[model samples]
Target: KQWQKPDHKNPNPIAFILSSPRSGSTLLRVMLAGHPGLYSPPELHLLPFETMGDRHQELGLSHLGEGLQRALMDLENLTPEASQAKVNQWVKANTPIADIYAYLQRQAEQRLLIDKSPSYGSDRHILDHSEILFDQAKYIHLVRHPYAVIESFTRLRMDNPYALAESIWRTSNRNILDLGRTVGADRYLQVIYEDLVRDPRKVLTNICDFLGVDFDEALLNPYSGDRLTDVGDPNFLQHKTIDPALADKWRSITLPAALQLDTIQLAETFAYDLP
Candidate 1:
């Protein structure tokens, strides 16, 4: 159903930041927003749900409507004074996930539109459908150490945080790797969270090179950009500067031995090891 929609008119270059939850995607988003030629928004979650036939039932009407409303409110910074009709007009105009994103890209006004939905990496269909929606889509796979990602999940009280987090990290990266092979290296770039915080400018420069955009030093100061919609971890939203200390805080906590082994094995496969 989504693919049948009219191709977006005047669409700009589009990109996605793919990773598991709590993998420093929001930080990377803010940094990317510093570039005047880029419009990096909060997680759109546009591809997580099945778009064919009766999307309401596919994603649940309440959940689908609420997610779209929240994204629209944040994108437009709407106030209570704004007429409900105005909101409804925009909502009605953008339907099925593809149109919603295409409309957002058009609104970006010639700037590259970057959507940072970490969960998109979990499903290969999401990436595949994205290519269908935006023919020029590019991808950036962001990764973090498994221990740190697991710790963050536990802190948030995610059930079976160790197993869940580890599975998510492995699946997300694997999907990205698979898609990268299909899409070619030029259209996909991988960056580690630890490396980003340690040398943001250098990492960003490399990303710029991948995207064929001129690198600007301003990307190092993400907070200088327009206020971003807070759709990520609350703790991450509070910080304005990149802090390397955030990378390895899991070291202070005791982890299950089995979980640690699984994490390390996966980490090593990704060319990472416990510090």
Candidate 2:
């Protein structure tokens, strides 16, 4: 038996922002959500891993779809225009995987949406499933140096021992590269955290050209100005400006633990460029 579409109609299509954690996704989400045409939710980790650890009981393929649908439904309260073209485009691009036109039509409300999930990179199979399920979906693959990523991971207590971070980084980075290759480069847009940090205006302009959205200065100050809450830092609910220096702070702390990390995983761990 197949899943029936939701009662609500979805107009705007969904795009995926897939990348490893500690790769500037949080920053990119802040910037990208600034686009007037898009409705990007906070990191929605609906993949199989949602079932991991103590949260195992909360996981399932059906629940995953429902969670995604609900997230979109949440957006309908904010926007009125539903773009059928955008939804149809998503379905067309993901034809071979399996058709989810009914699902999109059921959830139709807006023309543009984003599914920004860092967990997706840990498993390549999600791409196949996502392609079959969504009407039109493109990947915004965020890349950051493995060393920097591991440094952030350790600094944030995301993982212990630089080695563990390295292993995870290597695996996730490899999976991302493999998926990009399989899906064909056209479906993927590589966003380097370093470049984005170095020249936000230019890089954001580049992203706008790729996604066909008009860039806004609000993307630069998602914290200080009017911006979507579902997308930015949860702490931003109370805090004003996020620690801007956090972007490359890895450089400073990383040196102390550099040798330990370099011994485990070097510069080539990621498909993207390194410092």
Candidate 3:
């Protein structure tokens, strides 16, 4: 069966928010949803994802997996003359995520689609999976202070919370930086969770400019919009306005000694001041 690729030139292309979980990506998604020309429908974990929600029921191995198929092709290493590598390249060039995103964009009508699944930031495989699947898709590399992100690990209920949290923040941002080098500057943007919460209008205005859309005042009030997803930080939908205080709240929360040394330098990469 032939799959149609999404037109990279479409008026409503998919712009994925790439970052680690607990980095305030949900908040940004909610804020973007309020824009009349952008629509975010739940966290669509389209690339080999586990759901904290019901979206998985609509798509799974049945509709996606050319990326996996490419892996199978890679096993053909025993084949002569780079034959299998060529086949793998074809698979990468014609992946299904493009089609699925195109379907969503068509359904969205006038609005461009933004997917905020933090799962994609887990590591290099899933991250590369997306780049292969949607080579022309736009990306927003979101980051947060490492200390702040680690504090939420317990809230997210992951075991060995501190160690796991720090690894995630480090790996996600590191991978994002490398991916940034692969994608063109025009199709990429980065938003700091701290800056976003501190002055939403300014950060959001810059985001709109990056997206080539006019900034709407509605974006400044994320809580005014309907919940984009049922799963997120408990307080995600509770607040009716951006709390600049959340940016500094981590300063009061003690960072585990286990996470201190390694993270101090990384925090500087984002210009996140730490004491």
Candidate 4:
């Protein structure tokens, strides 16, 4: 079924923080959330799933049922009955998913709404669909060393973590680069995780300029303990301060020769140096 686009002008500007998992997205979200002009949420996972709806009818709307239920439950801490009720109400009221997002922005009461979903970088379809739905939105692609990402996943005890991490990093950044070329430089910007931790203010200033907002020193203090909705890595929320030391901790770990060869080649694409 075809739907009509909403006629109202969006008062709240939207931005996406795109990266692979363990790419310092939490730190970026914390910094951006501190800004008065922005309302940053923790890992909504809205782009690829929520926004797509049942465009592919064969999958049926049931495909979204589970993810939507999980999202509402995580976001609001609601019981199953309550979460379903809320989703039903939201679906009844909002014709298209973009309208649902706009409604959320109004409810948050911020001039800018930031969706910091690291997984968004992996899917080109999500980026392309987003351009159709929210053409005005800007994107920030955050990148970290593949070795660091792999090490973090290994610590979590994932099976074949190094291979998985390398795949994730390569695919996500590749999609990001493709979208950046399609959208051009004005709507997309890249930030290195190491650079961010090293000089947060400078990196944030550049981000502020890209988003057309004035720099605010408050961004440097993202962990001031004001409560906000977040559904991401648990360990990330416990930190009250930025830790630059977290950038290259992977250097201490010994990598298998095969993994190193592949990882080093992939890392070089992003200009990462391998020792």
Each candidate structure's TM-score, on Cα atoms with residue i matched to residue i, is: 0.82, 0.67, 0.76, 0.80
Better of 3 and 4 by TM-score: 4
Ranking by TM-score: 1, 4, 3, 2
Which model, 1 or 2, shows the larger lDDT?
1
Q: Model 2 scores what on Cα lDDT?
A: 0.57
**Winner on lDDT (2 vs 4):** 4
Which stretches in model 2 have alpha-carbon errors above 4 Å? 1-13, 49-56, 59-108, 224-247, 254-266, 269-275
What is the clash count of model 1?
0
lDDT against the true structure, each candidate: 0.71, 0.57, 0.68, 0.71
Q: Model 3: which residue pairs collide?
A: none
Per residue, candidate 2 scores C-alpha lDDT tens digits across 1-275 of 23223334333346777777777776677666666677655654544321223122444332333333334445544221333333334434533212243343344444466667767777667655555454455678787777677776776675546777776666666677666676756567777777777778888887777777777787677565444353322334554543445556655654444444443453444443344
lDDT of 4 at 128: 70
Q: Roughly what TM-score does model 3 have, to 2 decimal places?
A: 0.76
Error of 1 at 60 (Å): 5.7
Evaluate model 2: give its TM-score: 0.67
lDDT of 3 by residue, 35-74 (tens): 9898765565665432212123444334232222222233
lDDT of 3 at 218: 83
